[PDB]
Design a protein around this ligand. Structure first.
Ligand SMILES: [Mg+2]
Ligand SMILES: [Mg+2]
Ligand SMILES: [Mg+2]
Ligand SMILES: [Mg+2]
Ligand SMILES: [Mg+2]
Ligand SMILES: [Mg+2]
Ligand SMILES: [Mg+2]
Lengths: 185, 187
């Protein structure tokens, strides 16, 4: 059956660190794990394309989406099918927060693109590492992005678990572990 | 006072040739013209990436869409705003033909994706260079037949936008026919 988990937040929020520690904890539990990330998990070359100077928000989202489509199809769905716990460091919510809340793109369009792109795959849980924006385009943009993530979590409070990114790393990892314990047996 | 025109059809249907001839004709009429193409008119690296890579149809489409988004914003709309006749060898109809009719992607989704990607920009006229895949001068034949039939299906639903030409005809006969259809829109 597998289990799909994501870690989200601004760059420098510790989401990469936590993804990694989660992968290792679950592994010690004897659970097969597949650790992945966006962007690049589908099309590693998308990382080049994404840095294009003055890229329109629409084009940026579409590149993220192309990578995501490939990632879901070639990496994530097959990992779940094999019974793995698949953990992604960034997924759809990142796009929604950066390209939607940050760059202003309409959420409904983002979600319609995403519906075929992802084959409707949602994570069972998403751990949001909430980081003050000054610790991450400029400050106004990162404020919109930070708040955007918080908006998405309010909106799907069953799937999101919001954690304070300024806590010590080992306390964050323990909180992730406690939200996860019920879903393992 | 811009005018957006596209050329569509299979690879080898004479698009480049006719684009070039139509640009010349407009130049002769004293009309500023800009000649462009997809893929790669937005993000050149999507074109080269996709020459050598084996993706899901959805990923392929979305990469073409990203290129198209940049193309429309950075090249097409700016040329139109300057009053140029902008001619693209390939546009959204190519993705619908190849990825929708060819690879089987849902057509409404493709259109909804394209709606923001293009800012709603549609060609005023699109010249479809129709020919059987076996006749093209530049999956197997079945895929290409689906694609060819896709273009013809798009055309028959949109007779106010498409002009269909038999692409097996001599190059100059095709050009004359394109010019006749175009004249009413000029100047
Ligand atoms: Mg997406
Ligand atoms: Mg996520
Ligand atoms: Mg929607
Ligand atoms: Mg067209
Ligand atoms: Mg498109
Ligand atoms: Mg047909
Ligand atoms: Mg159709």
């Amino acid at each position: 059956p597998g289990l799909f988990l994501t870690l989200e937040g601004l760059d420098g929020s510790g989401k990469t660190t936590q993804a990694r520690r989660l992968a290792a904890f679950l592994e010690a539990q004897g659970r097969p794990v597949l650790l992945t990330r966006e962007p690049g998990g589908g099309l590693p070359e998308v990382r080049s394309l994404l840095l294009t100077q003055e890229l329109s928000p629409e084009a940026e989202y579409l590149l993220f989406s192309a990578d995501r489509a490939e990632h879901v199809r070639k990496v994530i769905l097959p990992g779940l099918a094999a019974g793995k716990v698949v953990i992604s460091d960034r997924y759809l919510d990142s796009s929604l927060a950066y390209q939607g809340y940050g760059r202003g793109l309409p959420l409904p369009w983002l979600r319609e693109v995403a519906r075929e792109a992802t084959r409707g795959l949602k994570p069972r849980l998403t751990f949001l590492l909430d980081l003050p924006p000054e610790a991450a385009l400029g400050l106004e943009f990162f404020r919109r992005v930070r708040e955007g993530f918080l908006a998405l979590a309010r909106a799907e409070p069953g799937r999101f678990v919001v954690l304070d990114a300024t806590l010590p790393e080992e306390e964050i990892a323990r909180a992730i572990q406690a939200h996860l314990r019920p879903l393992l047996p």
